[PDB]
């Protein structure tokens, strides 16, 4: 950070990860703040740079307590981010994980509909 | 203390740093602690003397601060009086414009000293020599105080002697042929009152007569009678018939500061960087940087700020072999 | 500023009293006064006030009286590193301390050396240069011809500077290694031991700096050659000094090299040394009634390649008649054994060392060191000690009182802790093998009497061999019954004995229910004893002992007993009575701090809630803090009698914070409100808005009070209020950001960066 | 060998720097460069003992100039220099001694007073007697030296070393 914020972003992502880790402590301890902590996580992620290498770490830290299905839309953005970042295979993996079924093995079968947003994203 | 040592070293070039230093500097004099304002006023005087006549755009603020801090305290009084002395030396004619803003302060100083600290008046009087032609339109305000000081019995003898010397020095720079000639009468009583002080009195009388010229010769007889009674003579009575350069970079301590031989731990290396950044300033060839060494020692971020410039100053002096080391 | 002067006047007069206790009390009084009562005023006037303070200091240091100088030195030591590293302090302190060192009395000697160490540790800008002076001076005092007092000065100053601040001292490491060995050979024992201690500290420094060195050092090797020179007979022909002194110096040097090379054998030494110092501290208390571990790789290699040499040298010096060399050998031999025991077994060094040390236990002055060596050697070698097991065990038995306690009753004799620690490490070595032996040895150790070493070794034996664990309790419990109730355990006396009895009763775990018998008794006599220490200890133990009883109510609900419940309840009532009614504040603080959440079920009752409410308005502030914390915790348990009371209280702190103009009361009110907020979220949540308004207007006050405690504690309270109310504050958070940033950017405002940033983070998170 | 620092204090325009160059180089040149802070070194011998002297010429001070703390930590020897051709220098050296002692309480510390510019006999306005009287008022040691009389400068520095040794011995 003595040179430019652009270089310091690498360490600022680590700061973000550690503060979110403290928020994981709070999430485990206090059931009443789980929705609020989830919204804080969403907003802070929206504030971060849209890079898969950092979104992966942040969502992996979040995965300690919150599964993808509990924060569906967040992971959908990750999928979208991986869709347009030369990592389409990871986007497909994320979308099949979120759907729970793989239409890539059921090409004839029509797509799922229980979760229509993720169907649209996939 | 650092800024002064820069302004002293550069000389007139220091004027280029006026617009940066003064607007903060004066402001600090307005908000600094009382114990430090005396030193800041003294350094303001030194800086004004170095700057000479280029202090005009800040002189209104300077005199404002002077007025609203010229309390009747001996220490600040003396420091401020020194500041007026140095301002008079710096400006001279221009300072006329700023003279009327200080006369009431001078008068209150004259009539409100009640201690051996009365010596402060002498220092104020020690400024009045340096005024000269810029006292023309305000001589008659500053005259009656000195008139009192001639024949004041309560005032100490050295104060009266100083007053005589002051009017003596004023004699050769002001036109006393006007009403001011009346000061002949005061000193006469001094001649007939104080015996130990008659010498300066007669020196002053001689100088005044020399300034007056023909206009005094008519009124000789009373002074002649005084002299005959006192039998003290002077020659004039008979005449009534008719930058800082560079500094040596100590090389030994310079490569010694780069002593990374036995520095291992992180604390060791941070201490090495600190000591090196300080020693570069201490051994810096430029007086401007070396003036910052004392402040850098007690404030490391200053040392960090000038590490590059300090190294440049130290490096440009070394020869090929020292540079190679 | 009449008070600011007169306070120092009475401080100076008290410090001039010839009584050591009076001077020391004045020392901590002045420390308190300057520490947490003269921080309301800023740094520049602090420097100005230091002029008067140092005038008063030197008024003590000026006189040639030893006691007046000692009092001045106490004042200086208490005043070094207590406030910020201001300017005027360090020059005056350094110049004052430089005169003391040549002094003769070792008391002022060590005091001044430690003072120099702490002054260098003060962490100001002038420390660096200052260190380079003192070390140089110290080194210059080692090059003197003899210059005894100054040699001891250099030794002690180097030692305390080395441990105090290493970074500045390491730059003088090479001159130190060039010069210290001059003082190591000094013919006086004190200089010798101190010089080896300074060498110890410097060697530790070199050891931290070793692994990251580009290349291996030479200091260890040079030290070994110096020791060899010490042992060389030809080089020992220097006149005017004793050969035995060179022997002692060389042995001490080798001991230190081995220690820095043998941390694994030094850890047990350090633990046993802590136990021995615990025994000494207990003895000192009775009389007054009436670290980091490191191993040097290069030193380890050097001794690996020069182990036989040192062993032969030590075993040759074994036969010395001088006591000091005998003790140094007794300290070194077990260290050597712990270094490379395999060489002890193979090279057959066991015989000579073991015969010598078993001969030393007979010797009077070496007996303590003899048992030291026995205990350390037992764990050093865990196989070849079997041949020697009876030969040591009978010595421990002889040292302890014989079996016939009643017939041959000891008149007055204290068993030194080294015997007990030797027993402990002997159990460590061959624990299961000697289970019966330690079983037989158990009885006379209990017969010795209560000592800290005894309790420690009983705990160790219990942990090492659990099989007979129940015996150690069943005996010691009975011993406790013989000193607390002065009766056998059925299923006046020294203050220190009872104190330690309470310590072990509360600390050492027991399973038998008979502890309950103690509890009531501890709540009947000791809590009511006129000795403040006995009362404090009884309160502590009665607090610790009820956790198993409360566990039945908490964890094992199927086995809740009315007997245990009533015992806990009335003991708790007695504890609260003690913690409320006793005018002494320390007992109150300890009692209230001793009530954890475990007791909330019995503290929810109105009877105890009344006592807690009384504590909640105590004269002393810390007791008030514990009281409000406890009541806030209990609010969830019994809202009826607490929530109204805490609401009235909240009104009181709001009134005091909004009206009181004095800074200290404002700070105390802010702390009280913060504790209430953190401890009773349910109460504050509906009243968050007025509290936040009051705190904001206290932050935005046009008049900044001189002290920083008010603003710091207001910020902390705002932060934890945000922590309580998550989103309710969302619409008062932007103004808080504006205020917090405004105070962060400029440091002129008294608000501290730490708490401001903490409040900002808590606001963001909440 | 014993390493000794010395700090040279006094009013501006008095020949502190001139004395330092005279002692360390034997020369004397009139440039009048206001010395912000200078350090010189020599390895001399006094009473057959080798002292490595490190001389720290401080910038001139006035009665209002604060006393830097740097010259109160590790100095172990002071040379208070005043010009015999300036009463202002005498008054300011009195003030500087006061401020130095204040910076070390009033602890005994090796200090010696030097009447500089002795060769300027015509311009002298301080005589020997009052300079001495001040010195034993401070319990210090008096000397007079000039930048053209190298023997006197060597005497000054030898004398401060001797005074430091004596104070150390006590
Ligand atoms: N005639 C004569 N001149 C001297 C003598 N000592 C010093 N001076 C002159 O006085 C001038 C100032 O002396 P200097 O040594 O530079 O003062 P300083 O105190 O070091 O300089 P500053 O940084 O403190 S302002 C020099 O130009 C020097 O030549 C002396 O004994 N005789
Ligand atoms: Mg100079």
């Amino acid at each position: 950070a003595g040179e430019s914020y652009s270089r310091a972003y690498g360490a600022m992502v680590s700061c973000h990860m550690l503060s979110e880790l403290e928020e994981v402590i709070q999430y485990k301890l206090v059931p009443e703040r789980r929705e609020i902590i989830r919204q804080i996580w969403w907003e802070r992620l929206q504030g971060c740079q849209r890079i898969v290498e950092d979104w992966q770490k942040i969502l992996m830290v979040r995965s300690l307590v919150v599964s993808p299905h509990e924060d569906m839309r967040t992971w959908l953005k990750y999928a979208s981010l991986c869709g347009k970042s030369g990592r389409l295979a990871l986007a497909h993996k994320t979308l099949v994980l979120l759907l729970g079924v793989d239409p890539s093995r059921q090409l004839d079968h029509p797509l799922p509909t229980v979760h229509p947003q993720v169907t649209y994203a996939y | 203390q650092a800024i002064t040592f820069i302004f002293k070293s550069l000389g007139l070039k220091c004027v280029q740093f006026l617009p940066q230093v003064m607007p903060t500097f004066l402001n600090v004099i307005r908000v600094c602690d009382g114990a430090i304002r005396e030193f800041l006023f003294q350094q303001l005087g030194m800086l004004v003397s170095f700057v000479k006549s280029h202090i005009r755009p800040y002189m209104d603020e300077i005199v404002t601060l002077m007025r609203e801090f010229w309390v009747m305290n001996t220490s600040i009084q003396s420091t401020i009086i020194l500041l007026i002395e140095q301002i008079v030396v710096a400006l001279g004619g221009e300072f006329k414009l700023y003279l009327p803003q200080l006369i009431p302060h001078m008068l209150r100083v004259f009539m409100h000293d009640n201690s051996p600290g009365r010596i402060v008046s002498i220092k104020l009087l020690a400024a009045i020599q340096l005024f000269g032609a810029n006292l023309d339109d305000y001589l008659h305000l500053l005259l009656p105080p000195i008139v009192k000081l001639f024949d004041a019995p309560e005032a100490p003898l050295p104060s009266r002697k100083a007053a005589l010397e002051t009017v003596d020095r004023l004699t050769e720079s002001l036109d006393f042929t006007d009403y001011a000639s009346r000061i002949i009468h005061p000193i006469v009583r001094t001649l007939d009152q104080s015996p130990e002080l008659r010498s300066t009195a007669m020196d002053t009388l001689s100088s005044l007569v020399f300034q007056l010229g023909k206009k005094y010769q008519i009124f000789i007889p009373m002074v002649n009678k005084v002299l005959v009674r006192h039998r003290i003579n002077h020659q004039r009575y008979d005449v009534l018939i008719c930058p800082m350069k560079k500094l040596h970079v100590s090389t030994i301590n310079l490569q010694k500061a780069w002593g990374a031989a036995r520095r291992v731990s992180k604390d060791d290396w941070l201490e090495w960087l600190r000591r090196l950044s300080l020693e570069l300033l201490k051994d810096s060839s430029s007086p401007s940087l070396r003036s910052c060494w004392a402040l850098a020692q007690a404030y490391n971020p200053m040392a960090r700020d000038l590490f590059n410039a300090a190294f440049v100053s130290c490096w440009s002096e070394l020869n090929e072999d020292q540079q190679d080391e | 500023t009449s008070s600011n002067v007169s306070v120092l006047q009475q401080f100076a007069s008290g410090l001039k009293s010839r009584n050591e206790e009076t001077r020391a009390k004045a020392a901590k009084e002045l420390q308190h006064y300057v520490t947490m009562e003269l921080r309301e005023m800023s740094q520049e006037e602090s420097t100005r006030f230091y002029d008067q303070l140092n005038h008063h200091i030197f008024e003590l240091v000026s006189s040639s009286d030893a006691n007046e100088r000692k009092g001045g030195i106490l004042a200086i030591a208490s005043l070094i590193g207590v406030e910020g590293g201001n300017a005027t302090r360090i020059g005056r302190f350094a110049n004052y301390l430089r005169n003391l060192l040549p002094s003769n009395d070792p008391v002022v000697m060590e005091m001044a050396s430690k003072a120099i160490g702490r002054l260098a540790m003060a962490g100001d800008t002038f420390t660096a240069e200052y260190v380079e002076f003192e070390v140089k001076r110290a080194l210059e005092w080692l090059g003197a011809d003899r210059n005894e007092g100054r040699r001891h000065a250099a030794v002690l100053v180097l030692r305390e500077l080395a441990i105090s601040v290493p970074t500045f001292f390491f730059q003088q490491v090479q001159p130190f290694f060039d010069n210290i060995f001059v003082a190591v050979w000094d013919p006086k024992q004190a200089i010798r031991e101190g010089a080896v201690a300074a060498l110890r500290a410097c060697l530790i420094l070199t050891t931290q700096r070793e692994p990251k060195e580009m290349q291996k050092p030479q200091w260890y090797r040079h030290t070994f050659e110096e020791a060899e020179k010490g042992f060389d007979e030809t080089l020992a022909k220097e006149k005017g000094m004793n050969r035995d002194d060179r022997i002692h110096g060389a042995l001490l040097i080798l001991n230190e090299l081995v220690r820095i090379s043998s941390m694994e054998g030094e850890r047990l030494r350090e633990e046993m040394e802590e136990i021995t110092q615990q025994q000494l501290v207990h003895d000192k208390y009775c009389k007054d009634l009436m670290s980091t571990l490191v191993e040097s790789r290069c030193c380890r290699d050097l001794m690996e390649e020069k182990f036989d040499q040192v062993c032969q040298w030590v075993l040759k010096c074994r036969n010395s008649k001088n006591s000091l060399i005998q003790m140094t050998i007794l300290n070194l031999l077990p260290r050597l054994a712990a270094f490379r025991p395999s060489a002890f077994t193979d090279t057959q060094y066991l015989q000579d060392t073991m015969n010598h040390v078993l001969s030393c236990v007979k010797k009077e002055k070496e007996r303590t060191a003899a048992f030291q060596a026995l205990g350390l050697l037992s764990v050093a070698v865990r196989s070849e000690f079997k041949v020697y097991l009876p030969r040591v065990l009978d010595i421990i038995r002889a040292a302890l009182p014989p079996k016939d306690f009643a017939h041959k009753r000891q008149k007055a004799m204290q068993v030194d802790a080294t015997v007990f620690t030797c027993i402990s490490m002997l159990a460590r070595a061959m624990g299961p093998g000697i289970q019966q032996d330690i079983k037989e040895l158990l009885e006379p150790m209990l017969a010795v009497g209560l000592s800290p070493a005894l309790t420690a070794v009983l705990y160790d034996l219990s942990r090492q061999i659990p099989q007979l664990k129940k015996d150690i309790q069943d005996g010691l419990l009975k011993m406790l019954s013989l000193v607390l109730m002065h009766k056998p355990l059925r299923h006046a006396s020294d203050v220190g004995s009872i104190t330690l009895a309470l310590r072990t009763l509360g600390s050492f775990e027991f399973e038998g229910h008979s502890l309950t018998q103690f509890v009531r008794h501890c709540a009947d006599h000791f809590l009511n004893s006129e000795h403040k220490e006995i009362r404090m200890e009884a309160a502590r133990t009665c607090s610790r002992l009820l956790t198993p009883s409360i566990h039945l109510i908490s964890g094992h609900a199927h086995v809740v007993s009315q007997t245990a419940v009533q015992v806990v309840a009335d003991v708790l009532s007695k504890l609260l009575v003690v913690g409320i009614t006793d005018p002494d504040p320390d007992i109150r603080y300890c009692v209230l701090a001793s009530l954890d959440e475990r007791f909330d079920a019995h503290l929810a009752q109105a009877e105890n809630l009344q006592a807690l409410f009384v504590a909640l308005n105590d004269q002393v502030f810390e007791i008030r803090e514990l009281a409000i914390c406890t009541v806030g915790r209990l609010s969830s348990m019994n809202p009826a009698f607490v929530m109204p009371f805490l609401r009235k209280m909240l009104i009181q702190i709001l009134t005091e914070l909004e009206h009181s103009g004095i800074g200290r009361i404002k700070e105390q009110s802010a702390r009280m409100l913060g504790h209430l907020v953190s401890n009773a979220p349910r109460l504050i949540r509906p009243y968050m808005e007025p509290i936040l308004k009051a705190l904001i207007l206290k932050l935005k006050d046009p008049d900044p009070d001189p002290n920083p405690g008010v603003i710091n504690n207001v910020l902390a309270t705002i932060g934890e209020l945000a922590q309580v109310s998550g989103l309710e504050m969302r619409k008062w958070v932007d103004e808080l950001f504006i205020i917090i940033m405004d105070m962060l950017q400029d440091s002129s405002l008294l608000a501290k960066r730490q708490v401001a940033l903490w409040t900002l983070g808590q606001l963001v998170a909440s | 060998s014993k390493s000794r620092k010395i700090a040279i204090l006094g009013y501006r325009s008095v020949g502190k720097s001139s004395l330092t160059i005279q002692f360390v180089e034997g020369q004397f040149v009139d440039s009048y460069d206001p010395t912000i802070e200078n350090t010189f070194t020599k390895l001399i011998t006094v009473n057959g003992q080798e002292y490595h002297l490190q001389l720290v010429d401080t910038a001139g001070q006035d009665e209002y100039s604060i006393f830097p703390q740097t010259y109160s930590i590790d100095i172990n020897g002071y040379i208070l220099v005043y010009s015999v051709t300036s009463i202002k220098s005498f008054e300011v050296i009195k003030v500087i001694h006061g401020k130095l002692l204040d910076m070390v309480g009033k602890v005994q510390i090796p200090i010696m007073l030097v009447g500089n510019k002795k060769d300027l006999h015509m311009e002298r306005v301080i005589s020997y007697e009052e300079g001495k009287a001040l010195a034993e008022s401070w319990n210090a040691a008096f000397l007079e030296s000039s930048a053209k009389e190298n023997q006197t400068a060597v005497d000054v520095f030898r004398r401060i070393i001797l005074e430091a040794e004596k104070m150390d011995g006590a």
Side-chain angles (χ1 to χ4, degrees), chain C residues 4-286:
Chain C
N4 292 332
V5 178
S6 61
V7 65
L8 302 187
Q9 300 194 139
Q10 75 255 12
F11 278 149
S13 53
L15 271 162
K16 269 195 182 279
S17 184
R18 293 192 176 81
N19 171 242
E20 155 69 17
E21 283 81 10
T22 297
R23 292 180 184 270
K25 187 173 192 283
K28 283 73 62 183
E29 285 292 327
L30 193 151
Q31 212 264 340
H32 181 74
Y33 186 71
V34 298
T35 311
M36 60 219 78
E37 293 181 355
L38 277 296
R39 275 209 165 165
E40 312 199 68
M41 45 67 70
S42 179
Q43 190 273 332
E44 307 168 34
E45 63 268 19
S46 185
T47 299
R48 262 182 279 111
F49 172 81
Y50 262 96
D51 289 337
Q52 290 82 17
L53 197 42
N54 296 115
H55 158 61
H56 296 309
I57 278 164
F58 175 21
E59 278 180 328
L60 277 71
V61 187
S62 178
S63 179
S64 64
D65 189 359
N67 308 277
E68 300 182 88
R69 159 171 298 101
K70 272 162 180 183
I73 294 164
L74 267 298
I76 287 165
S78 52
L79 272 161
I80 291 150
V82 69
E83 289 184 353
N86 292 319
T88 292
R89 319 172 75 188
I90 177 157
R92 292 219 195 93
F93 281 137
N95 287 266
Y96 292 143
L97 293 171
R98 286 172 184 173
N99 316 327
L100 309 168
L101 270 292
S103 56
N104 297 114
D105 188 358
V107 183
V108 62
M109 202 66 207
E110 177 262 357
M111 282 155 78
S113 61
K114 201 90 74 172
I116 291 169
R118 297 189 93 268
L119 183 57
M121 201 185 48
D124 51 7
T125 67
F126 303 107
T127 187
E129 300 89 50
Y130 172 55
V131 167
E132 323 186 359
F133 187 81
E134 293 289 351
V135 174
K136 267 166 56 213
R137 197 183 55 142
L139 300 170
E140 171 173 4
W141 290 359
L142 291 185
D145 293 331
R146 183 65 176 67
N147 202 359
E148 188 286 321
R150 303 270 201 66
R151 264 196 191 191
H152 195 192
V155 174
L156 281 168
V157 170
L158 291 163
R159 162 42 165 61
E160 316 277 1
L161 275 171
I163 62 170
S164 175
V165 64
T167 304
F168 307 114
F169 184 80
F170 191 64
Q171 293 314 70
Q172 304 266 270
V173 66
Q174 169 54 237
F176 174 81
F177 277 102
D178 196 13
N179 285 277
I180 193 67
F181 301 109
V182 174
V184 165
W185 309 124
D186 198 279
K188 189 173 76 171
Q189 170 200 347
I191 297 169
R192 192 170 322 110
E193 292 181 354
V196 180
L199 175 57
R200 173 188 184 180
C202 184
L203 279 166
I204 301 314
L205 268 54
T206 296
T207 294
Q208 279 78 31
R209 276 138 189 80
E210 190 265 309
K212 315 188 273 281
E213 289 218 10
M214 302 65 69
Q215 92 286 1
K216 60 169 305 166
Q218 183 264 11
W219 300 297
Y220 309 112
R221 174 157 36 80
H222 181 74
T223 308
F224 196 94
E225 320 286 319
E226 184 84 357
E228 165 148 35
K229 287 169 49 58
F231 273 137
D232 277 0
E233 310 192 53
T234 64
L235 287 157
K237 297 187 173 189
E238 301 202 77
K239 299 170 180 180
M241 81 77 68
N242 213 25
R243 173 198 89 84
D244 294 1
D245 274 353
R246 310 272 307 181
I247 301 299
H248 191 188
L251 267 162
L252 286 164
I253 288 163
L254 292 183
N255 186 0
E256 278 297 355
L257 290 164
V258 172
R259 177 220 308 280
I260 296 89
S261 70
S262 179
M263 51 95 68
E264 66 275 58
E266 181 58 34
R267 205 199 323 280
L268 282 293
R269 280 215 74 258
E270 265 167 17
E271 304 165 340
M272 180 251 279
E273 183 178 1
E274 293 179 353
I275 297 170
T276 311
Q277 260 72 63
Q278 281 164 15
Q279 185 83 26
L280 293 186
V281 167
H282 183 156
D283 198 35
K284 187 190 161 182
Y285 179 47
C286 287

Side-chain angles (χ1 to χ4, degrees), chain D residues 11-18 28-35 57-60 116-120 146-148:
Chain D
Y11 194 58
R12 73 191 78 262
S13 89
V14 64
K16 310 182 299 312
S17 300
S18 66
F28 162 53
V29 164
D30 306 0
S31 169
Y32 183 58
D33 291 331
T35 52
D57 178 340
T58 74
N116 198 5
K117 309 198 201 161
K118 166 162 61 49
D119 50 41
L120 292 179
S146 307
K148 293 185 285 185

Side-chain angles (χ1 to χ4, degrees), chain A residues 44-62:
Chain A
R44 213 186 271 121
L45 185 64
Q46 272 213 300
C48 276
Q49 191 175 1
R50 279 179 154 78
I51 284 168
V52 176
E53 284 291 276
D54 319 306
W55 270 51
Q56 173 200 269
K57 299 180 179 175
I58 288 154
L59 301 153
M60 182 179 72
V61 167
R62 286 163 189 206

Side-chain angles (χ1 to χ4, degrees), chain B residues 12-28:
Chain B
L12 280 165
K13 298 159 58 53
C14 84
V15 175
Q16 73 209 52
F17 304 106
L18 281 193
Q20 321 179 17
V21 170
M22 220 65 58
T24 308
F25 185 70
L26 313 182
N27 168 45
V28 174

Side-chain angles (χ1 to χ4, degrees), chain C residues 87 92 95 98 140 150, chain D residues 4 69 72-73 76 102 168:
Chain C
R92 292 219 195 93
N95 287 266
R98 286 172 184 173
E140 171 173 4
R150 303 270 201 66
Chain D
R4 290 266 175 275
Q69 197 157 252
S72 50
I73 291 284
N76 70 10
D102 186 74
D168 194 1

Side-chain angles (χ1 to χ4, degrees), chain C residues 16 74 89 110 140 266 298 323 356 485-486 506 596 655 739 753:
Chain C
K16 269 195 182 279
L74 267 298
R89 319 172 75 188
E110 177 262 357
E140 171 173 4
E266 181 58 34
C298 301
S323 52
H356 174 50
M485 302 83 88
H486 320 89
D596 317 318
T655 292
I739 297 157
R753 188 139 45 201

